[PDB]
Design a protein around this ligand. Structure first.
Ligand code: HEM
Ligand code: HEM
Ligand SMILES: [Ca+2]
Lengths: 152, 148
């Protein structure tokens, strides 16, 4: 099923603001069920043709997985050099700098919010982290409170 | 009143205020009539709150925001034609950014900030960020409304 439309609008807006305000080239959010299973994937910074070429959506593997069990923020300067990295699939843009956070409400997990490749070639900042966390928290509020499906 | 909602709305106000680096931030939630249902804020000391006495009714620029729900971003709130004025003992405030707190179906209130640091006006960036936070608040309110 498609995401509830208000939830989707809210999540795309949160991803866009996060991406813009930390000056990331790419931004993404995975929306999960309560068991960390990826349900939806919201992103920006990649053109449609490149999206078609990559083909398959992410499974929430590699570095992204770390955000789920160690729910504190993670910054890396060369994300795919991390030993948990699965690697980029064919056609995916190479990415180096990373800032990622879990999306939570209290102790419930709702997904992940992560950004890559700060445009000045610089590492993500402390201020960037704090902002990203606040956005994630807002995202957790949206997902937790989102309208559940209803038959006509 | 609702305590877990109230705490959610306060967290959103805190996020808007601190991230934009405003001195003051508020959210007002109204009924279909416009009776206030929630008014949460930060940046003003309890002593000044008592001095003001009466709660806002949602007039002036806020009223405008209720009437025409779209972002409103001003160098000087007192200079807007729809400005009603501050009551006695209210802290002076000058720069203003307000956005609706809403979902597609309905708008429930207004999230608003004043007096960005160093006397600077609120930016487009600030406005977009506040809209994103407000939207999350809008979902939380909608969910609460859904109570029978
Ligand atoms: C635009 C925002 C995006 C960001 C910030 C992002 C970031 C990342 C990162 C950091 C990794 C893993 C590095 C590692 O652990 O090896 C990854 C892997 C991956 N990405 Fe992306 N990516 C984005 C967009 C996309 C899109 C649009 C697609 C597909 C349409 C995609 C498909 C994949 C796949 C299949 C993997 C392999 C790991 C997995 O299955 O989870 N990505 N991405
Ligand atoms: C701290 C966050 C606050 C902000 C950002 C804020 C801002 C504002 C603004 C922008 C106006 C409209 C001015 C105009 O239209 O000319 C206003 C008016 C008003 N304010 Fe505040 N305010 C805050 C807190 C308070 C508090 C704590 C109270 C007292 C309980 C209060 C009481 C009022 C009253 C009575 C009005 C007159 C208009 C109306 O009734 O809605 N304000 N304030
Ligand atoms: Ca540091």
């Amino acid at each position: 099923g498609a995401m509830d439309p208000d939830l989707e609008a809210t999540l795309r807006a949160i991803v866009h603001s996060a991406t813009s305000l930390v000056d990331a080239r790419y931004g993404a959010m995975g929306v999960h069920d309560r068991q960390h299973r990826v349900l939806h994937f919201v992103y920006e910074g990649i053109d449609e043709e490149t999206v078609r070429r990559i083909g398959h959506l992410p499974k929430g593997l590699g570095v992204i997985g770390l955000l789920i069990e160690d729910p504190k923020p993670l910054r890396l300067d060369d994300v795919s050099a991390h030993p948990a990295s699965i690697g980029f699939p064919p056609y995916h843009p190479p990415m180096r700098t990373f800032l990622g956070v879990p999306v939570r409400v209290r102790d419930e997990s709702f997904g992940t919010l992560y950004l890559t490749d700060k445009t000045n070639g610089q590492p993500f900042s402390d201020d960037d982290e704090v902002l990203v966390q606040a956005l994630a928290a807002a995202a957790g509020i949206a997902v937790a409170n989102a309208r559940l499906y209803q038959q006509a």
